[PDB]
């Protein structure tokens, strides 16, 4: 809930979802891949049906010892009520977003969210009758006067996506729970992995993560997770039952196994980012530096009011806006950065997008910056070798 | 497209999907997990952008070479132009009703459609201004009576959930077609497990599948799919991929697998699950059994006419409502049927409802039975076996 | 047994395994963690019986298959191997020592023989030959240090069918403390009961039909109680063990086995059937076609067939000819291995199988055609194989 | 290396292995599929050099873990295993024969010793055994039959550090020809680089630090251009293997090992320099720390600690007094093996430690305790440290 982390993070990291139940003698739990549960008796199944959201085994569509171990884990973690795992992140943002809403329902979403987000709100909801309504993700206590009568849900994603704005948290929450005290409150919060920012601690209903990212931490695993208090978790829960929502037991168990990693690679995501940041800040060929760790980004002051630590992707403006030839020459020729779409792997990553691209997935907002946008995500590898490749790409555009 | 199997469908199922590009030299596809998927160059990106939906590598929420070479063989086996992908059956039927509707339309469904299938109407579907109306299973012809202007969906399930009503899907499609030419036909194709029942071939738009059933065929992995022709493809394919859905590569791999014993099993499955319909069916305790493939049964001769083969799921009315202590004294003692959810798998498998239950689960219908209905699931075991296991039930309750 | 398949469906399948799924969990592992000193010392004491002390003596998985294997093939316990072939090596080295000698079947699968000639040579442990067809005869060659008698039938390539029985009965007349083996890959444990027949050790490559879709490899080898423990430790001592996910797999293609196997019967007899009517065809090796070497016994003594068989060409092919033959089959695909799904196709010439034939000679002069038939329809398989006779006729 | 850490992440890494993803593809085979003559031609030529040819030689999963092992250790190859104790069994089986003579460390793993005195003693393999300090005196106990020198450095529970140069160098004036082999587990093949130092072959129970997870089992053993081909030969003779999905999880889990090993590092110094101070502790064995029996050479030779370390008690204690220990931990946990993100510990009382010190007695009369650091809060290990040095004070 501050810039602190807990004094036991690593040992909750190593520890979290790891019950006798679950690991049967070995350290990690055990794999139960299932569909069919079997009843010994018409009592036992009478007894699972009860308790069929509740850890009993009932039906592999609500879960095994495997699913159960990584919600205990995520709820431990992220100091919730239950976790409900979808797909992907993508999977976890449109059915948590679906499972409290209803024709004539408003949402208001910050404009710096990731974009297949702002797609299912444009594209899924409103074709519904649910209408979304965006905002400035410095908005802060203002976010009061976009409030509706028929506001039902207000989606925060801090950072944000690409431009890495960090929100006022608790100035959004104080004022939307002024205006309308039982809003569902909502946030992605992937670039935290959950742990970063004790969402749930600042009055947030739900927090989403794209497992895929830093969870499996290894780029090869896709998956969702959404961490509900007690007043939401039913309605989820149930909502996302509904519509088909899970994960395979394989993928719950590599997340769970993510987790106890988390902490040591974080760190040196956190190290590595930050000291590429303080190197493009002073390097001539960068206009700007989007990182929430590093001074003078947008919100970095409640980043580091809120958070305790950082990952490792963030982005940055050249000084100029590059042609489609310097594009190429810039980009196809890294050593160690690799072209690809997601983050919070080993690897680092290096993406771009010109101005008026990011413009148009910033809905009723202009961007204030000319010069082509670099994405980074910062992998495990020494940095002095990541900044020789950004030095070799700044020698191949000046 | 009718009762004769193509001479050449154990050769399919062996094959469908088996191209050097996936599998690179294995028997099987490869197994690439991924979310990154790593482009060389922007030119390369560019192209990767430009065919995310058509097999080339791009993202991993869009598929890898194992989701791609699952694809290839489920339209190849279905006859369609595009396979979608789910984490299970019921997130298959969700997301694609989901994807042919918007406020304001009507969907037309079996009274006899699998519960969840239901629920996600009732549930989540009237929330977001969606209405459903229901069906008899054996309407046929006279479904032209029951759309409406509105009408954009029309769901069959054949045979039905639990009762096993067999539609006749040419008098429904063709009468549907005569009001409403440009309505999405869908079907839950799983106890056909999408080859006794080539629904592309009669006119259906989209053949759905909880894969989790005969395709994987042992009861240990969770997956939907959805087979659309041409005309519903892209609409099915980007409004899924909106909502989240795929699945992991990894069980995407087993459904392929699972397919090259598909031809084995499933001919057991009908050899058994008859022999024991036939048995049951001049048994002083059995009031009705409702098997496709047994003369009598609902529907039975548009099984004999439409499909080339039976599975080995059906169900059958006892002759008296059993009391609880008798359930528990039948279904709790049995040595080879186990009590589960689910089918499809090796296992043979029991489940009891009473009448009432049953319909509560009819919407606008009553049920014609006043005894205990059991559904049995019948596996490889040797059937003898599993008809001693039989009689020692009834010898539990006579 | 009429209560195979119900067996298969079943085996392995106890509570403490699969905790509410059908299947097993798949408990992956090596350190396993006890509570207290007295669990410690309880894994310790039955570290070999089933309690959970070290990924290396194995998980919950391992105990599943171990148990099933053994109920399936009769036995006393079931060791597991990263595939066949160290199944066979280490089996074998089990029960030697320097000065011992071990008498293998001249039809034994390569690496078999090759694990005795270059790897138990240089040991101290000497190895003889016998044809498949010696029955009591074997008793001649049996040896005052002779420790090991292993036997494969049908056998590779050739597909020649022992007569256990008398083998045995010579064996145990001569020298009745002796370690009788055979790799049972082919009848996959199931359709020769082995261990009945008085053979102390059945050994399978479980890659082939037990895992049933070429994509894992895992040995097994059950043995009876007089041999199980010497067994046990020794492959213990060498490492051997299988990895937690390919158990699973392998409990998981028990199965499907029963429906599998019986379609390969059926669909490679009706193959066979036509190869020995064909007038391109020399000879064809298939133990439940009346004529082959050794058939009385595959009749006698065995449930079934699988789907592997061979036959022989008029004419050893030149490579230009298995090229234009090989290349170009639809269906059939040329790959080593075989028990899977999908039909397979592999050529040896006969001077070749000569070389792997210790002390033996070929009596055949054509080009060996070695045909795995899988589940695809057997009409279209015909039709492939006649393509390719079309092709060099 | 300033590049470890990027070479960690790249390692085994070719767009042929991951056909676009960022790690390797998982190619699960035994079948691989030739699609002419030609092209089996080519793989049976090269079935040793990297092409597709036969499961049990490798697919394309272990081929890019092959690759990473040879460019992180510095080898001509590397040989898979189901397992470390199958690494190293098959590693030494691989290089004698009938009348060789194998020297070995006597603080070598108990597995490892078990394998010489229970299976090369009886095939006609004598071994002989050395003090880990004996240095350049080990030229004194060189036979002409000598053919194998096995090192572990650290030892197996009491972690003394070998002087290799002195040793190697030693061995090479007197048997140039031998093979030099070490158990380099605890190093991960990486803080300590074996063939740079003139070893032959560098074995890992890549289960413990490679895997990192403690959910999976692997040996590696990698070979410098002299000894490859033997190695890998024999080995395939006895049919060692690792499946694919094992190969994919060692090469993920190299991609960690960097911030894992720096952690296990910080981590276990913190609690051995803690644990030197305490009176209730006679001995630390961590090689990291001063005065640990052949810090010096750790100091040297190595590049960094892993987090396995170990300590002597004041008493041998009681079977009564180790329960009121060891059960009542919260974050150790009870288990063999190591190298995983959980802390664990194992007790070893020094009269079991004197029987698999073969020709040694030990110098220590109390309860050894042996750690492996974890990940975890490094002062809630010191607490749950602390708290058992109370139920026993
Ligand atoms: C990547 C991303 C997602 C989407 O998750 P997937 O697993 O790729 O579907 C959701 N939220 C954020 C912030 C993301 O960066
Ligand atoms: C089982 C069932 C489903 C649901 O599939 P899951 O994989 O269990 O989610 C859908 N349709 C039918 C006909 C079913 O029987
Ligand atoms: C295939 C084969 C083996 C070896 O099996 P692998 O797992 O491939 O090593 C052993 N015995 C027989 C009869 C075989 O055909
Ligand atoms: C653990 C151990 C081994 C054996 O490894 P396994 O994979 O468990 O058989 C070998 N060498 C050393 C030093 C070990 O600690
Ligand atoms: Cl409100
Ligand atoms: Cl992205
Ligand atoms: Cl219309
Ligand atoms: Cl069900
Ligand atoms: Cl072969
Ligand atoms: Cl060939
Ligand atoms: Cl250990
Ligand atoms: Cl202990
Ligand atoms: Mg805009
Ligand atoms: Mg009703
Ligand atoms: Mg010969
Ligand atoms: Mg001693």
Same mark, same amino acid.
């Given at each position: %809930?501050?810039?602190?982390?807990?004094? %036991?993070?690593?040992?909750?990291?190593?520890?979290?979802?790891? @019950?006798?139940?679950?690991?049967?003698?070995?350290?990690?739990?055990?794999?139960?891949?299932?569909?069919?549960?079997?009843?010994?008796?018409?009592?036992?199944?009478?007894?699972?049906?009860?308790?069929?959201?509740?850890?009993?085994?009932?039906?592999?569509?609500?879960?095994?010892?495997?699913?159960?171990?990584?919600?205990?884990?995520?709820?431990?973690?992220?100091?919730?009520?239950?976790?409900?795992?979808?797909?992907?992140?993508?999977?976890?943002?449109?059915?948590?977003?679906?499972?409290?809403?209803?024709?004539?329902?408003?949402?208001?979403?910050?404009?710096?969210?990731?974009?297949?987000?702002?797609?299912?709100?444009?594209?899924?909801?409103?074709?519904?009758? =649910?209408?979304?309504?965006?905002?400035?993700?410095?908005?802060?206590?203002?976010?009061?006067?976009?409030?509706?009568?028929?506001?039902?849900?207000?989606?925060?994603?801090?950072?944000?996506?690409?431009?890495?704005? =960090?929100?006022?948290?608790?100035?959004?929450?104080?004022?939307?729970?002024?205006?309308?005290?039982?809003?569902?409150?909502? #946030?992605?919060?992937?670039?935290?992995?959950?742990?970063?920012?004790?969402?749930?601690?600042? +009055?947030?209903?739900?927090?989403?993560?794209?497992?895929?990212?830093?969870?499996?931490?290894?780029?090869?695993?896709?998956?969702?997770?959404?961490?509900?208090?007690? @007043?939401?978790?039913?309605?989820?829960?149930?909502?996302?039952?509904?519509? +088909?929502?899970? #994960?395979?037991?394989?993928?719950? &168990?590599?997340?769970?196994?993510?987790?106890?990693?988390?902490?040591?690679?974080?760190?040196? !995501?956190?190290?590595?980012?930050?000291? =590429?940041?303080?190197?493009?800040?002073?390097?001539?060929?960068?206009?700007? =530096?989007? !990182?929430?760790?590093?001074?003078? *980004?947008?919100? !970095?002051?409640?980043?580091?009011?809120?958070? *305790?630590?950082?990952? +490792?992707?963030? *982005?940055?403006?050249?000084?100029?806006?590059?042609?489609?030839?310097?594009?190429?020459?810039?980009?196809?020729?890294?050593?160690?950065? *690799?072209?690809? &779409?997601?983050?919070?792997?080993?690897?680092?990553? #290096?993406?771009?997008?010109?101005?008026? %691209?990011?413009?148009?997935?910033?809905?009723?907002?202009?961007?204030?910056?000319?010069?082509?946008?670099?994405?980074?995500? #910062?992998?495990?590898?020494?940095?002095?070798?990541?900044?020789?490749?950004?030095?070799?790409?700044?020698?191949?555009?000046?």
């Amino acid at each position: %809930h501050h810039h602190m982390a807990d004094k %036991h993070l690593d040992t909750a990291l190593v520890n979290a979802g790891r @019950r006798k139940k679950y690991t049967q003698g070995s350290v990690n739990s055990v794999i139960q891949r299932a569909s069919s549960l079997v009843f010994d008796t018409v009592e036992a199944k009478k007894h699972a049906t009860r308790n069929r959201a509740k850890g009993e085994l009932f039906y592999g569509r609500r879960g095994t010892l495997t699913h159960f171990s990584l919600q205990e884990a995520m709820c431990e973690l992220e100091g919730g009520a239950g976790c409900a795992l979808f797909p992907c992140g993508a999977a976890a943002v449109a059915n948590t977003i679906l499972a409290f809403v209803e024709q004539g329902d408003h949402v208001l979403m910050t404009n710096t969210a990731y974009e297949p987000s702002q797609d299912f709100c444009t594209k899924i909801l409103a074709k519904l009758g =649910v209408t979304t309504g965006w905002f400035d993700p410095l908005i802060g206590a203002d976010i009061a006067n976009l409030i509706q009568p028929n506001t039902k849900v207000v989606f925060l994603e801090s950072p944000g996506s690409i431009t890495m704005e =960090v929100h006022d948290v608790p100035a959004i929450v104080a004022a939307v729970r002024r205006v309308a005290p039982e809003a569902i409150i909502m #946030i992605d919060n992937t670039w935290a992995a959950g742990v970063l920012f004790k969402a749930l601690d600042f +009055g947030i209903d739900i927090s989403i993560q794209a497992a895929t990212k830093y969870l499996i931490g290894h780029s090869d695993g896709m998956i969702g997770t959404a961490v509900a208090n007690a @007043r939401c978790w039913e309605q989820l829960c149930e909502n996302a039952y509904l519509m +088909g929502q899970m #994960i395979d037991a394989d993928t719950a &168990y590599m997340t769970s196994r993510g987790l106890r990693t988390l902490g040591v690679r974080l760190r040196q !995501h956190h190290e590595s980012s930050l000291r =590429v940041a303080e190197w493009l800040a002073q390097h001539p060929q960068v206009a700007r =530096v989007n !990182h929430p760790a590093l001074p003078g *980004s947008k919100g !970095h002051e409640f980043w580091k009011r809120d958070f *305790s630590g950082s990952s +490792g992707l963030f *982005s940055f403006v050249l000084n100029k806006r590059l042609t489609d030839a310097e594009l190429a020459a810039y980009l196809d020729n890294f050593s160690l950065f *690799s072209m690809a &779409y997601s983050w919070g792997g080993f690897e680092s990553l #290096i993406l771009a997008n010109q101005p008026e %691209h990011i413009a148009a997935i910033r809905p009723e907002a202009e961007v204030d910056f000319s010069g082509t946008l670099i994405r980074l995500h #910062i992998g495990l590898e020494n940095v002095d070798d990541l900044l020789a490749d950004l030095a070799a790409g700044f020698a191949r555009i000046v």
